[PDB]
Amino acid sequence: RPWQMKDLQAIKQEVSQAAPGSPQFMQTIRLAVQQFDPTAKDLQDLLQYLCSSLVASLHHQQLDSLISEAETRGITGYNPLAGPLRVQANNPQQQGLRREYQQLWLAAFAALP
Amino acid sequence: RPWQMKDLQAIKQEVSQAAPGSPQFMQTIRLAVQQFDPTAKDLQDLLQYLCSSLVASLHHQQLDSLISEAETRGITGYNPLAGPLRVQANNPQQQGLRREYQQLWLAAFAALP
């Protein structure tokens, strides 16, 4: 049950005025992420739709650092012999990795301003 | 029939002008809750969506007060040998607990000011 075009259109329109990482944007994006239960691929699509290449790159770097610390510590469900967290989160049998990816994503995007 | 994006986005759209505790806010919240019959999970999602973190924290303080009072006084179908009302309202076969939690939710929201 992935999102459709209308959901993305509403998500972008409702937060057109606000700035990335504002409390309003964080509310709406967090609700979307917690409601649709998407993988990393869909999150990348959503970010490309919402913010430009500059904000995309900044979030990419911040999320790289956050994932770096998180999975360098060691995580309950992460096994580094199978692939990067971006790929484990895309397997529907690793929901723990998917939820960790979602939370790192939202925190990284909130850490912009 | 848990609410999708569109329902919650509407709810926030018409709960934007008014402030918590005002007649309009409570009217809309009570209608939504009485219609969709949401558990504690969906209620917490809706609250995080609507108002700032400060208002959510205030509401949860009031809700903890109400729930503690009710558990001391006694609930019709509350059995504390399995988990708190908080967790007993997530089981779909406990309608009484769920409706009681919804009513305490609405009361605690109405008593913020």
- Domain containing residue B92: 5-111
Long-range residue pairs from A37-46, CB within 8 A, at least 24 positions apart, any chain: A37/A98, A38/A2, A38/A3, A38/A102, A39/A89, A39/A90, A39/A92, A39/A98, A39/A101, A40/A86, A40/A89, A40/A90, A40/A101, A41/A90, A42/A2, A42/A3, A43/A101, A43/A102, A43/A105, A46/A8, A46/A11
A87 Cβ under 8 Å from any chain B Cβ = no
B5 Cβ under 8 Å from any chain A Cβ = yes
Q: Helices A40-50 and A23-36 sit at what angle, rounded to 10 degrees?
A: 150
For residue B60 the two structure tokens come to: 């949860």
- Distance of residue B14 Cα from the nearest chain A Cα, in angstroms: 13
Centre a 10 Å sphere on the Cβ of residue A110 and count the other Cβ atoms it contains. Answer: 18
What residues have CB less than 8 Å from A48, skipping those under 6 apart?
A56
Distance in angstroms (rounded) separating the CA atoms of residues B38 and B3: 9
Size of interface A-B (CB pairs under 8 A): 28
Centre a 10 Å sphere on the Cβ of residue A27 and count the other Cβ atoms it contains. Answer: 20
A11 Cβ under 8 Å from any chain B Cβ = yes
Cβ atoms of B51 and B43 within 8 Å: the answer is no
Domain CATH number, residue B75 = 1.10.375.10
For residue A94 the two structure tokens come to: 């690793």
Residue B31's φ and ψ, nearest 5 degrees, are: -60, -50
The residue with tokens 């580094």 is A80
- Distance of residue B100 Cα from the nearest chain A Cα, in angstroms: 24
**Number of structural domains, chain B?**
1
Chain B residues near residue A11 by CB distance under 8 angstroms: 5
Torsion angle of C-alpha atoms B52, A98, A20, A73, degrees rounded to 10: 90
A37 Cβ under 8 Å from any chain B Cβ = no
Residue B109's φ and ψ, nearest 5 degrees, are: -70, -35
Resolution (A): 3.7
Distance in angstroms (rounded) separating the CA atoms of residues B46 and B51: 9
Query: b or e along B4-40 (b: 16 or more beta carbons within 10 Å of the residue's beta carbon)?
Result: ebeebbebbeebeeeebeeeebbebbbebbeebebbb
Dihedral of CA B11/B14/B19/B24: which sign?
A: negative
Distance in angstroms (rounded) separating the CA atoms of residues B62 and B19: 17
For residue A100 the two structure tokens come to: 């960790």
B80 to A5, B73, B74, B84, B99: CA distances (angstroms): 45, 13, 11, 6, 17
Method of elucidation: cryo-EM
B16 Cβ under 8 Å from any chain A Cβ = no
